[PDB]
């Protein structure tokens, strides 16, 4: 029905997962 999606980091430019509130690389919080 409503499947989430990935999100390109806004600091290091790492492509995070849909369930990754923060970045698993820079450790910064999404959006």
């Amino acid at each position: 029905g409503s499947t989430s999606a990935m999100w390109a980091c806004q600091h290091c430019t790492f492509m995070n997962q849909p369930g990754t509130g923060h970045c698993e690389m820079c450790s910064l919080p999404r959006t």
């Binding site: 990935m6 290091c12 790492f14 492509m15 690389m25 820079c26 450790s27």
Partner: protein, 76 residues
């Protein structure tokens, strides 16, 4: 070829690699230049996480490319 390494700290490192080499070589290079651990080094590429088990061309990296280094350690 040469690849650029943009750090979140605001630093850009230029190195010499090839499209046939491996990510393990690129990380090992940045280490010999800066001294950052490979286990902590996070190579980012336009939304892609490079792995030592892969190759530069495997991800479609060309000459004069630009990657982003990230340190994965405790902080907050």
């Amino acid at each position: 070829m040469q690849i650029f390494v943009k750090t979140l700290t605001g630093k850009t490192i230029t190195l010499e690699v090839e499209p046939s080499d491996t990510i393990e070589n690129v990380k090992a290079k940045i280490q010999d230049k800066e001294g950052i651990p490979p286990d902590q080094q996070r190579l980012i590429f336009a939304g892609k996480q490079l792995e030592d088990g892969r190759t530069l061309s495997d991800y479609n990296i060309q000459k004069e490319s630009t990657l982003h280094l990230v340190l994965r350690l405790r902080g907050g």
